[PDB]
Amino acid sequence: KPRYKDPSVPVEERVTDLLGRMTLEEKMSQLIQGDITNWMNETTGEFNLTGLEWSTKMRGGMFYVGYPVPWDYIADNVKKAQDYILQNTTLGIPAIVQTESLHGFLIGNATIYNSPIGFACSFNPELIEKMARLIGQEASALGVNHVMGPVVDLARELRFGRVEETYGEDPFLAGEIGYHYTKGIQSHNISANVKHFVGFSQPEQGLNTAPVHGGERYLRTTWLPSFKRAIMDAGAWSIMSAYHSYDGIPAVADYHTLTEILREEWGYKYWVTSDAGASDRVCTAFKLCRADPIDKEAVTLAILPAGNDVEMGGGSYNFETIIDLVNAGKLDIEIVNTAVSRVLRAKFEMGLFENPYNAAPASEWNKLIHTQEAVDLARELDRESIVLLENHDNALPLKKSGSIAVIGPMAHGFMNYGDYVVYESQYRGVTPLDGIKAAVGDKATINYAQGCERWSNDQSGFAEAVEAAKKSDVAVVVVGTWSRDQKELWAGLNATTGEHVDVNSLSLVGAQAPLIKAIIDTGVPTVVVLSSGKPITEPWLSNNTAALVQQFYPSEQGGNALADVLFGDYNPSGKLSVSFPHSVGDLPIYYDYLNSAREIGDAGYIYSNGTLEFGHQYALGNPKAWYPFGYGKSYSSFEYGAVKLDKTNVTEADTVTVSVDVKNTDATREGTEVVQVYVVDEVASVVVPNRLLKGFKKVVIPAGQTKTVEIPLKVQDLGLWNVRMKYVVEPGAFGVLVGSSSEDIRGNATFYVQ
Amino acid sequence: KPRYKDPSVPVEERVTDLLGRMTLEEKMSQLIQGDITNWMNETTGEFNLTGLEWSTKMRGGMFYVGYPVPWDYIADNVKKAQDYILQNTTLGIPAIVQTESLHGFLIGNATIYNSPIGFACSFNPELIEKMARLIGQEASALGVNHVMGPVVDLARELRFGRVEETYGEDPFLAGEIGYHYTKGIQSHNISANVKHFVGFSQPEQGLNTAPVHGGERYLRTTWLPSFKRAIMDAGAWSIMSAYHSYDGIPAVADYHTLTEILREEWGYKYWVTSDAGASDRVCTAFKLCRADPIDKEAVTLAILPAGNDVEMGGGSYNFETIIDLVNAGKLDIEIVNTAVSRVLRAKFEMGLFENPYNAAPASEWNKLIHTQEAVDLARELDRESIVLLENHDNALPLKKSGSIAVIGPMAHGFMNYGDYVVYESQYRGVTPLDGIKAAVGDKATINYAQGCERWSNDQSGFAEAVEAAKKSDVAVVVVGTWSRDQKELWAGLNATTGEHVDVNSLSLVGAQAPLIKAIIDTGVPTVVVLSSGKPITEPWLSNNTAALVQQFYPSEQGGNALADVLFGDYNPSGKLSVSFPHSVGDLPIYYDYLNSAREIGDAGYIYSNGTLEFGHQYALGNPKAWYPFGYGKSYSSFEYGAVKLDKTNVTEADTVTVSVDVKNTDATREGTEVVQVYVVDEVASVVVPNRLLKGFKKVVIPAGQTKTVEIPLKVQDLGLWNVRMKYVVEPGAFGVLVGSSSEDIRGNATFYVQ
């Protein structure tokens, strides 16, 4: 009766006991990711015994299952791998079973949620938790016990294709969503995988995997907080390191971050895996070792002792040299023992040794995956993420009567899903046209015209769209950006966002802007919906359209969510998770810019009639955000009262509770406001962010009513990184700005730390 | 008689002896910059004795004289101030007398050289050293003994207004020019002032004075080298600190850079001044102290102990609190003593105590300022700076016969000088039209038409320009960017470059691009001259025009220099000091990007007929340079032979001499080539720049001849900053790429450090 098999033994002793029975071959197997296609034929589902035997022995710790195959292919072949481990190895160390979950379990016919950049606009972490719980239920049904999220990278470089996968530009909002997502996932004993550690998403020129310029203060002030929350407070069982270098140290091989910060400072107890092919990049991209033939020893010696425990597939499996390095005396066995211990500790705490089998039987999968509860939530979370940017003269909400033109490439014909969806997803779900026709039924005439193809400058379709508008009371035009599913993205089909699709312009592509102009020029009131994965730069829309709506990449319920807002069944409540610049020329545009940035001189202007008004910052443009972080309108108006703090003279150990009464001055409808609290460290020892979101509350306010909003500020969380790179909450004044966006401040107060 | 007065006493002993005789008031006075307008009325020249007494007592160490006044106002009032020091103070500590010299002594009717971004394209540091010697002659004539250059900031942020004041994007080229400029100046016992220390010219969003994101590795690898050469090798007697923060530490208050690096590592022996109002910024922009009323103590305590010795004017003279701080026990007298000592030591080394008077008599100024030698050099250096970008079917050089159209806002009507020119400069000098007319005399008909105004979208002028082209055999169109003199710049007149004039676009402004198209459509062969202070993004010009010429902001001889190239009296020899992007959306674009950057996937393309071809990096654009660093054509072709190294197995103490024979295959013309040597550290312990200019040689090769070019590489200069932030030349292979640009490599070799 080996002690490691006994659940009454403390976890640390179970780890010790198991580790001391393991051969070096078995230890290495734990640290190298396998793949379900080592024993499962992706096209036929046929089983290859020899490949399972090899995979288990050589890369047996964990394996990837993110293939677009039938449900039973995943479940039956995961089962065979777990049964093989249990019945046909000495030690029976259960496998971690890994797929993607970003905005839904990555398998066909599972529930697709709106993209992360969008659900961040909900400012509704509780609802995002509920999502993560239902995602874990779907994944769990087929035998998955690990998912490759959350992404707690920040949208700080708008040209980068993966903006959509983030929770926005702000550390606090991302950290809070990260925490909730992780909690909802791990509530099922499914491992989260907090990614991409660390400082990944500000690549040079916006290019996928390109290196990042920045210093240690920026890393600790802005990049690291969102990881800290998911890791330290939500107890994430795994982390993925990143593809980039940060001031010239590769993320995958950074001892300072992966060991000194992650373990010595934060006490992280579990494992870090590389990204996919990230280990080879040490030689191939970064040129820190010989690329041909690849110096597998050198790669291993760079990343494993740095604290990157596990090598992901997609590369050359450089970690197969661990045995040789140990025999040569070049790698201390204790480094291997620490990495293995981290993996085993996660497996014990996940419960895998007591319950290695996750999956439900085939007869139950339809009762666990794509449930009405999941579909309903997708629509709820989607509708709560929609951001009203403009609404002139009560154009919205639309009346469910008369005639309505529905125009534009994104209105119909394909679902405008973000990246990290499975092949052929785009052929199912609710389009804006579907949604709008469902909401009006027989009460309004709908006149649909495609208008243009998103990927073409061709204006053949304009006449039909102009005609549709001209015979309608109002026009809805749906344009934006597009991405691709996991097959089409990597086959090279055209895209304007997604992993490895980066842009040098944020303006509407192809004929989409000219299509809007042709409709507006009919004089019919035109509502423009932006359907997209990042900011779009078209400032002329704000005041030349009747209304302007942002729906970041939808859920499978997107068109219903959208029509719920358009016709006013739901009073829009989204706030921007990411700042909108006037031009790609104006980047970066994050709201949390250090003092001395952004607001410097006078802006120039180009008028549409040709007149140039010359300024300084810039000569002929404006570095101020077109729309700021936290911006979002309502059909209802909100009047804030005086801001109150419960305590004014405080200590670094205190909590200051911010209070404010918010009145819904609309007498006819309920409205939801997101009250946002920004902290300003007024006078600091080093230069700090001008203002930082440090709390918020989304509240539903009945018509004509006043609601008391209370938001706590833990003083310990408002510090900075001083000249000695120590975290301190320096004595002195802290401003508290309370408002409806990062710019729209409605009241303020000041407290003093002593 | 006191030891400090005796030239035979060692300098450190002279400093000790003098410092020991100074009151704390006299010490304070050395560390605070005065201003000649404290005793000279700017408009009348009247002397104010009271104001000289006060300036001398309170801010008497050094004073500024950069006012647009007659020569005798400067000379007579400088004399008054030096005479007052000598005869009417106890100690007779001569004043340092400061002005600007960026591309010419900053006084009316002195020689104006081309702007620095242009003269860097000459790759001729010896000629630039000649320029700095003549500049010092001109300055010295009026009693100036300190000039506020060189700028050794790098043009790494192309939106930033002061790109034109830099020597380009490359550390090595900027370092070499900085060295030579410093040496030229100080050959006259005139102090250089190396600026802006350090990391200033990559401001966030390209906005003037905005903070800079970067780590210490980037700072040491890229930003600091150019400072090192001027300071440590050329012996610069003064430094100016910068306006920015770097990873959140203000440059003005950074102990690590100003003291640890500059003194403890580099052994710098002299003084550092703040920039203008840069002291107040500590409270006002950076928010590190109370702004109102400004906390003068806190400013002083932040910058003086950090190693910023001298407070410049343009602020609140926070240093007047030095005395109170010493009295309160808050500032150690030894800090002040160190700072004063730094100033005195410079003054002793400059020879000021033996020769405090610089100036020549009134009757000689016309023989010392704006001499034929200076005017000729301005034309020679300007012509050597012109970069031929394209030349199809031998459109260039032009014949001095037939008819020639000269078109565009920059062809005539004003001189397109860069910034750091004195009020009303723009009304003197040779315009392109002036130069072209002088060059052809009666041998060709010149058909001039303005075409458009640079600051306007109005196309009224096009028909006249079109007519001018149509009645000519060839058309020359001069467009680009424009700046302003020191008065008009700060009065707010319109500009597209210069200090506090930043841009969010690099496309030709106003009617300029459409002007070009209108002329081209004429079918007359069209040569475009870009007349500008930074890259312009118009890729369509390369193959839609007959030829394409870059003249960065001209000298007062610009039009002659331009005509010298256009008509082929000079075979153009310039090479780009800064890389040209396709679009402002593609930034940054420096040639020395870290491995893993820039070269990542496939580029898309927008055809002029509207067809879209979608790529990845970027979807619809190209992150590769339109023209790279070091790019420049000639009328002549050059054929490189095999590259040879004199040594292959070397150590860090050795020098490797690169040799290659370059043949001028042109049978009719002499031609000048700039041979460029880029070093590649093949395998490194940390990520490094992909390639780095480490040597070059500009050679004149007679028609048909072959010339041996030898370029030395000191191995000690080819190292990196490792993970412990130590500079190391790591054993292993170094690639040597020899070519006509950073991209056009014609030969290579490898040596091995042991």
Ligand SMILES: *[C@@H]1O[C@H](CO)[C@@H](O[C@@H]2O[C@H](CO)[C@@H](O)[C@H](O)[C@H]2NC(C)=O)[C@H](O)[C@H]1NC(C)=O
């Ligand atoms: C079943 O699995 C094993 C995987 O081990 C496969 O064996 C490999 O065969 C390929 C090509 O034929 C060789 O490149 C590899 O070296 C082999 N790998 C090993 C470790 O043996 C086998 O081909 C698979 N068979 C089927 C039908 O899929």
Ligand SMILES: *[C@@H]1O[C@H](CO)[C@@H](O[C@@H]2O[C@H](CO)[C@@H](O)[C@H](O)[C@H]2NC(C)=O)[C@H](O)[C@H]1NC(C)=O
């Ligand atoms: C997840 O894992 C833990 C560890 O297996 C489970 O906790 C055990 O729960 C079992 C119930 O079968 C109990 O008998 C043990 O007392 C618990 N052990 C510990 C350490 O708490 C937990 O139930 C699992 N949770 C879920 C949702 O599956």
Ligand SMILES: *[C@@H]1O[C@H](CO)[C@@H](O[C@@H]2O[C@H](CO)[C@@H](O)[C@H](O)[C@H]2NC(C)=O)[C@H](O)[C@H]1NC(C)=O
């Ligand atoms: C962008 O991708 C789409 C596919 O989504 C391409 O459209 C297909 O193109 C071929 C014609 O070459 C047709 O046979 C298909 O019927 C088209 N499919 C659809 C859904 O329309 C499109 O051509 C691509 N565009 C560009 C410019 O690359």
Ligand SMILES: *[C@@H]1O[C@H](CO)[C@@H](O[C@@H]2O[C@H](CO)[C@@H](O)[C@H](O)[C@H]2NC(C)=O)[C@H](O)[C@H]1NC(C)=O
């Ligand atoms: C001559 O010099 C003194 C400068 O010391 C001038 O006096 C100043 O007067 C101004 C305004 O008139 C006051 O604001 C300052 O406080 C004075 N400074 C000091 C310390 O006295 C005097 O105005 C000058 N006279 C001229 C040029 O006419």
Ligand SMILES: *[C@@H]1O[C@H](CO)[C@@H](O[C@@H]2O[C@H](CO)[C@@H](O)[C@H](O)[C@H]2NC(C)=O)[C@H](O)[C@H]1NC(C)=O
């Ligand atoms: C620059 O200053 C130095 C120091 O004052 C000058 O050198 C001195 O000149 C005298 C004779 O005039 C020599 O006998 C001394 O030995 C020199 N001293 C040193 C330290 O070298 C120098 O000539 C001046 N140079 C110029 C161009 O004016």
Ligand SMILES: *[C@@H]1O[C@H](CO)[C@@H](O[C@@H]2O[C@H](CO)[C@@H](O)[C@H](O)[C@H]2NC(C)=O)[C@H](O)[C@H]1NC(C)=O
């Ligand atoms: C840009 O600056 C020029 C000056 O260089 C302005 O033109 C001047 O405009 C003033 C004021 O109306 C006139 O009195 C001058 O006669 C103009 N000078 C010239 C050369 O015409 C010009 O209007 C400015 N343009 C803009 C759009 O700001």
Ligand SMILES: *[C@@H]1O[C@H](CO)[C@@H](O[C@@H]2O[C@H](CO)[C@@H](O)[C@H](O)[C@H]2NC(C)=O)[C@H](O)[C@H]1NC(C)=O
């Ligand atoms: C202008 O035309 C030249 C010649 O066609 C282009 O240079 C070529 O660029 C292609 C890229 O497609 C290279 O693969 C060729 O090897 C180059 N050929 C030569 C002879 O240089 C150039 O790119 C065009 N410039 C622009 C701005 O479009």
Ligand SMILES: *[C@@H]1O[C@H](CO)[C@@H](O)[C@H](O)[C@H]1NC(C)=O
């Ligand atoms: C899967 O099966 C098909 C045919 O049955 C075969 O062509 C394909 O190559 C197989 N792949 C692997 C890796 O076994």
Ligand SMILES: *[C@@H]1O[C@H](CO)[C@@H](O)[C@H](O)[C@H]1NC(C)=O
């Ligand atoms: C999804 O259901 C659709 C129904 O047409 C079907 O084509 C496909 O086989 C299903 N996918 C999975 C993974 O069950």
Ligand SMILES: *[C@@H]1O[C@H](CO)[C@@H](O)[C@H](O)[C@H]1NC(C)=O
């Ligand atoms: C695994 O072990 C069981 C015995 O417990 C055995 O019956 C079965 O044959 C084994 N399977 C394989 C694939 O070796």
Ligand SMILES: *[C@@H]1O[C@H](CO)[C@@H](O)[C@H](O)[C@H]1NC(C)=O
């Ligand atoms: C639209 O108009 C409002 C009201 O005048 C104004 O404040 C806002 O700046 C305008 N937006 C744009 C993008 O010009």
Ligand SMILES: *[C@@H]1O[C@H](CO)[C@@H](O)[C@H](O)[C@H]1NC(C)=O
């Ligand atoms: C164009 O608009 C500007 C902006 O108000 C105005 O001053 C100017 O006079 C207008 N010009 C024309 C040509 O209408």
Ligand SMILES: *[C@@H]1O[C@H](CO)[C@@H](O)[C@H](O)[C@H]1NC(C)=O
């Ligand atoms: C907080 O502190 C100041 C003393 O520094 C005191 O004057 C003030 O009344 C206190 N305010 C509150 C709200 O207790």
Ligand SMILES: *[C@@H]1O[C@H](CO)[C@@H](O)[C@H](O)[C@H]1NC(C)=O
């Ligand atoms: C210079 O003198 C004129 C009188 O000619 C006067 O108007 C002006 O104020 C004076 N400037 C100063 C600084 O005293």
Ligand SMILES: *[C@@H]1O[C@H](CO)[C@@H](O)[C@H](O)[C@H]1NC(C)=O
């Ligand atoms: C420069 O020369 C012109 C004469 O052409 C004169 O107007 C001006 O006053 C002179 N400036 C100086 C500083 O000598």
Ligand SMILES: *[C@@H]1O[C@H](CO)[C@@H](O)[C@H](O)[C@H]1NC(C)=O
């Ligand atoms: C300076 O000292 C000289 C020499 O004694 C004296 O003649 C002169 O009057 C003084 N000048 C001033 C302005 O005080």
